[PDB]
Design a protein around this motif. Structure first.
Motif, PDB file in Angstrom:
ATOM      1  N   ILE A   1       3.323  12.481   8.704  1.00 34.29           N
ATOM      2  CA  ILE A   1       2.292  12.524   9.934  1.00 34.29           C
ATOM      3  C   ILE A   1       2.290  11.084  10.461  1.00 34.29           C
ATOM      4  O   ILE A   1       1.494  10.209   9.727  1.00 34.29           O
ATOM      5  CB  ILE A   1       1.042  13.217   9.761  1.00 34.29           C
TER       6      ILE A   1
ATOM      7  N   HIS B   1      -2.752  10.925   2.490  1.00 35.65           N
ATOM      8  CA  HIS B   1      -3.260  12.092   3.324  1.00 35.65           C
ATOM      9  C   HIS B   1      -2.158  12.285   4.283  1.00 35.65           C
ATOM     10  O   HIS B   1      -2.190  13.585   4.890  1.00 35.65           O
ATOM     11  CB  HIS B   1      -4.506  11.774   3.784  1.00 35.65           C
ATOM     12  N   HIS B   2      -1.340  11.449   4.803  1.00 39.33           N
ATOM     13  CA  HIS B   2      -0.262  11.824   5.573  1.00 39.33           C
ATOM     14  C   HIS B   2       1.018  11.838   5.472  1.00 39.33           C
ATOM     15  O   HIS B   2       1.972  11.993   6.185  1.00 39.33           O
ATOM     16  CB  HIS B   2      -0.486  10.660   7.061  1.00 39.33           C
TER      17      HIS B   2
ATOM     18  N   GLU C   1       0.783  -1.281   0.005  1.00 32.34           N
ATOM     19  CA  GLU C   1       0.007  -0.123   0.047  1.00 32.34           C
ATOM     20  C   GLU C   1       0.782   1.142  -0.076  1.00 32.34           C
ATOM     21  O   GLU C   1       0.229   2.527  -0.078  1.00 32.34           O
ATOM     22  CB  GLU C   1      -1.009   0.065   1.232  1.00 32.34           C
ATOM     23  N   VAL C   2       2.117   1.294   0.212  1.00 30.41           N
ATOM     24  CA  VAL C   2       3.014   2.440   0.145  1.00 30.41           C
ATOM     25  C   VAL C   2       3.130   2.787  -1.246  1.00 30.41           C
ATOM     26  O   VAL C   2       3.709   4.096  -1.577  1.00 30.41           O
ATOM     27  CB  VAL C   2       4.320   2.161   0.704  1.00 30.41           C
TER      28      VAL C   2
ATOM     29  N   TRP D   1      -4.740  -1.803   9.767  1.00 33.46           N
ATOM     30  CA  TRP D   1      -3.250  -1.308   9.546  1.00 33.46           C
ATOM     31  C   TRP D   1      -2.643  -0.713  10.756  1.00 33.46           C
ATOM     32  O   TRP D   1      -1.560  -1.198  10.991  1.00 33.46           O
ATOM     33  CB  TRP D   1      -3.490  -0.441   8.424  1.00 33.46           C
TER      34      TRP D   1
ATOM     35  N   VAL E   1       6.074  15.897   4.209  1.00 29.44           N
ATOM     36  CA  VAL E   1       5.230  15.861   5.465  1.00 29.44           C
ATOM     37  C   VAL E   1       5.028  14.361   5.899  1.00 29.44           C
ATOM     38  O   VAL E   1       4.635  13.792   4.568  1.00 29.44           O
ATOM     39  CB  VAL E   1       3.969  16.662   5.164  1.00 29.44           C
TER      40      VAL E   1
ATOM     41  N   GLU F   1     -10.189  -0.917   7.598  1.00 28.55           N
ATOM     42  CA  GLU F   1      -9.076  -1.426   7.066  1.00 28.55           C
ATOM     43  C   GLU F   1      -7.955  -0.690   7.607  1.00 28.55           C
ATOM     44  O   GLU F   1      -6.926  -0.972   7.814  1.00 28.55           O
ATOM     45  CB  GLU F   1      -9.089  -1.303   5.544  1.00 28.55           C
ATOM     46  N   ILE F   2      -8.201   0.581   7.834  1.00 25.23           N
ATOM     47  CA  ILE F   2      -7.128   1.628   8.396  1.00 25.23           C
ATOM     48  C   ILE F   2      -6.964   1.222   9.893  1.00 25.23           C
ATOM     49  O   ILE F   2      -5.654   1.251  10.230  1.00 25.23           O
ATOM     50  CB  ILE F   2      -7.485   2.983   8.480  1.00 25.23           C
TER      51      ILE F   2
ATOM     52  N   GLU G   1      -8.071   2.007   0.790  1.00 22.00           N
ATOM     53  CA  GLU G   1      -8.295   2.988   1.717  1.00 22.00           C
ATOM     54  C   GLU G   1      -6.971   3.133   2.445  1.00 22.00           C
ATOM     55  O   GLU G   1      -6.844   4.182   2.828  1.00 22.00           O
ATOM     56  CB  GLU G   1      -9.119   2.088   2.677  1.00 22.00           C
ATOM     57  N   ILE G   2      -6.143   2.352   2.656  1.00 24.03           N
ATOM     58  CA  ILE G   2      -4.945   2.427   3.433  1.00 24.03           C
ATOM     59  C   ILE G   2      -4.012   3.322   2.595  1.00 24.03           C
ATOM     60  O   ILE G   2      -3.237   4.065   2.987  1.00 24.03           O
ATOM     61  CB  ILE G   2      -4.304   1.121   3.871  1.00 24.03           C
TER      62      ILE G   2
ATOM     63  N   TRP H   1      -5.063   6.806   2.840  1.00 25.64           N
ATOM     64  CA  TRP H   1      -4.643   7.436   4.093  1.00 25.64           C
ATOM     65  C   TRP H   1      -3.144   7.657   4.323  1.00 25.64           C
ATOM     66  O   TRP H   1      -3.104   8.728   4.675  1.00 25.64           O
ATOM     67  CB  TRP H   1      -4.954   6.295   5.269  1.00 25.64           C
ATOM     68  N   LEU H   2      -2.356   6.891   3.721  1.00 22.68           N
ATOM     69  CA  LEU H   2      -0.920   7.179   3.630  1.00 22.68           C
ATOM     70  C   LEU H   2      -0.840   8.349   2.746  1.00 22.68           C
ATOM     71  O   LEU H   2      -0.069   9.476   3.160  1.00 22.68           O
ATOM     72  CB  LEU H   2      -0.046   6.220   3.195  1.00 22.68           C
TER      73      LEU H   2
END
Ligand SMILES: [Ca+2]
Lengths: 228, 228
Positions: free
Chosen positions: B15, A223-224, A130-131, B220, B13, B216-217, A216-217, A220-221
């Motif tokens: 986070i 976004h961060h 997922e990275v 994770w 960034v 899912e997150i 989804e993961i 999420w990555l």
């Protein structure tokens, strides 16, 4: 000094996937070994991997590290410029892999104004897949921002590796999507159960592949872990 | 000196949500302010929050920090032991909140063989809700590991807050699940649009709630933030 050091700060395992630009002072050794993994034990004897790692470290490159900015990269993506490195050892290697590659370079790239990136992408096999979407988005931004005017490479040459399960499966699951959109795809015969695979993609196909890879993961990555 | 400092390490960034045990040397001020947010401006005048934060820092407690172990917690969960703190200012407060809590305490005290955690859980409103399952799993493991034999609390008293939309909505999305499994759940009249809400859950209901909350997150995060 720091009263929070040696004071229970490691009771909980915290594995974070932090993204960094390629760092020529830190990353060479680990990058060279990831290239050895990518090309395999036979083809590694046919490419000057020290030279290629040096080229990567002067190219748009993103690494992922879980042990801090000082530690070894466990994953990287690099876009090496074909035309600027047209006399490089690695270009010399790719020209000999197959007539489909040398013909593409001569007729599509040398012919006119179109630009080609040599994609180098590898990661330890325990790194989560997922990275990959945030990895590509950051590195593509490196190119677009430096080129300006939202420009980008026209084509991408991706070398990767697959394996026979005893059926063929993927070390890099994103290659399933790259293959769907590839303008040219071919593979060598398996050696020790490992298949060298070559793909030529245009930019539209690369973007479509990364979009279809999103989970989804990985969202999420993104976004961060992102540029400012 | 660190040659990777002041050398392009903030181009991206990053986070990360790192989990730590409660730290009495660092966390007091931020915990007390998170308690003020949890109880609201009226009920905060009725609880000795300095005393409660001190109790939390001597209890099984997990915090989440994005700015390193030295920085303020932006999220915490604590299980304060009822029986060990049965004369505490906070128990005195809960006994006068509502006859429904007092009756539960009596049934528990008279049973003599049941154990109850006072749950204190709060976070800044910008924290992502997906951290909640790993936060609870880590803190529950704090209890089970110390007690051994996969032991756990029998009951959990959770104070939380909800708000009127002009419809009622949740500051803590997990409360929607806790409510569905609650042995006891009642709410005070809204003041300034904010509703004080009180829930008593047994362990089975708490486990079911956390499982329903998993995404899912959050799964994770659990795979990357956990005890050794
Ligand atoms: Ca993460």
């Amino acid at each position: 000094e720091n009263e929070e050091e040696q004071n229970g700060e490691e009771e909980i395992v915290n594995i974070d996937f932090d993204f960094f630009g390629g760092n020529p002072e830190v990353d060479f050794h680990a990058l060279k070994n990831l290239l050895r993994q990518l090309f395999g034990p036979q083809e590694s004897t046919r490419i000057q991997l020290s030279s290629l790692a040096d080229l990567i470290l002067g190219s748009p490159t993103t690494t992922i590290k879980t042990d801090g900015k000082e530690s070894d990269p466990y994953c990287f993506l690099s876009f090496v410029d074909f035309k600027a490195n047209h006399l490089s050892d690695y270009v010399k290697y790719l020209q000999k892999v197959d007539m489909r590659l040398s013909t593409f370079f001569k007729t599509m790239i040398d012919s006119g104004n179109k630009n080609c990136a040599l994609v180098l992408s590898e990661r330890l096999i325990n790194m989560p897949p997922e990275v990959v979407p945030p990895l590509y988005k950051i590195t593509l931004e490196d190119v677009a921002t430096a080129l300006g005017d939202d420009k980008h490479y026209d084509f991408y040459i991706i070398v990767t590796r697959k394996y026979e399960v005893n059926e063929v499966d993927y070390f890099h699951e994103e290659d399933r999507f790259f293959e769907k959109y590839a303008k040219i795809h071919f593979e060598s015969e398996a050696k020790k159960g490992v298949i060298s695979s070559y793909m030529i993609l245009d930019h539209e196909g690369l973007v479509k592949s990364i979009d279809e890879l999103e989970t989804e993961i990985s969202t999420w990555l993104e976004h961060h872990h992102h540029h400012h």
